[PDB]
């Protein structure tokens with residue numbers, strides 16, 4: 596039993612809600628919140644910019660030290676950093692950016708990172724400015740993640756479409 600509220604169950608292990616991941620994190624304070632990061636951990640906009648803003652830029656400061664030490668992440672890769680005031684941990688996951696020509700097949704690799712954590716609050720990956728189709732991303736999530744994932748979908752129209760088209 597966890598403190599997530601009002602989620603629609605999609606499968607044995609996937610739950611979905613029309614919600615802002617930042618507001619969900621502030622309310623629930625989950626063990627793990629997923630960021631839809633880029634390889635540079637430059638948290639400018641979307642999920643990343645909004646999460647970072649909610650940490651008063653502490654996420655960016657921590658991330659810049661991480662990159663200075665370790666270099667960029669791989670597309671499809673991840674790192675675990677602090678969740679600051681939003682969660683215990685933040686799993687920064689890089690999905691492919693289709694507007695950069697990156698391979699959509701790497702979206703499955705990106706979601707595989709979720710399997711290292713028993714429970715996560717997460718956004719849809721690659722489906723923002725990264726240009727991928729959100730229907731496909733949800734299908735990949737469901738077919739890849741085996742741990743318990745609570746998906747926060749920002750756009751109401753998209754949420755309705757994802758639910759009504761979910762197979």
Ligand SMILES: CC1(C)C[C@@H](CO)N(c2ncnc3[nH]ccc23)C1
Pocket residue numbers: 614615616617631641642645718719720721722723724747748749750
């Ligand atoms: C609509 C997007 C460009 C795509 C989507 C991630 O696929 N995203 C968000 N999803 C959930 N909570 C969110 N808070 C702030 C942004 C945000 C931004």
